[PDB]
Amino acid sequence: RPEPELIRQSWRAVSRSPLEHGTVLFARLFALEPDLLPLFQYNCRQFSSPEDCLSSPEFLDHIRKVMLCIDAAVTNVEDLSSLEEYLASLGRKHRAVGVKLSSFSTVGESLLYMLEKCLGPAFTPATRAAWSQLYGAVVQAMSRGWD
Numbered sequence: 002r003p004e005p006e007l008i009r010q011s012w013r014a015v016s017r018s019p020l021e022h023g024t025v026l027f028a029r030l031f032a033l034e035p036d037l038l039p040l041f042q043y044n045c046r047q048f049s050s051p052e053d054c055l056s057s058p059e060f061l062d063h064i065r066k067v068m069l070c071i072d073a074a075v076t077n078v079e080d081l082s083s084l085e086e087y088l089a090s091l092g093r094k095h096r097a098v099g100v101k102l103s104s105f106s107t108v109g110e111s112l113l114y115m116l117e118k119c120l121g122p123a124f125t126p127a128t129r130a131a132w133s134q135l136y137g138a139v140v141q142a143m144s145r146g147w148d
């Protein structure tokens with residue numbers, strides 16, 4: 002159970018510009034794991050240009066979906082069991098498109114980077130710990146989807 006106010010007050014800041022913050026998360030994620038980008042080519046409907054896929058409405062829509070999912074976790078920070086079935090279904094969908102479960106740990110590192118970029122020293126160790134616990138719960142629920 003992550004401290005709710007630390008999660009809510011930090012998420013509120015990133016919610017002011019969710020697409021811009023999501024782009025920052027993905028930029029770190031791709032630098033840490035370059036193999037992830039070719040998975041998005043199918044949604045883009047073209048395999049010739051990674052850069053065109055990165056700037057595509059289809060890629061932006063995925064960023065919007067990711068921010069909505071994190072928003073649902075933040076809304077349910079007090080009880081994440083409500084989203085257990087949905088997160089397992091999300092885990093199934095990612096396994097279906099070739100995503101490895103290990104890449105979700107890399108997404109967690111990118112999320113902390115996005116938050117530190119947005120908040121600076123306001124991203125306190127307690128805030129970082131709260132986000133680590135919340136994200137760890139989200140990936141533990143999504144992990145059951147892989148089975």
Ligand code: HEM
Nearest residue numbers: 037040041044066067070071091094095098100104105108
């Ligand atoms: C590891 C990086 C990620 C990759 C490679 C990835 C890949 C994908 C792909 C390829 C799709 C499209 C599936 C399809 O319809 O064919 C998708 C859908 C989706 N992704 Fe991700 N994703 C990643 C991270 C995340 C994260 C961290 C979340 C939030 C937990 C998320 C939330 C979603 C959602 C909500 C959809 C909904 C599409 C649907 O209706 O099924 N993604 N993902």
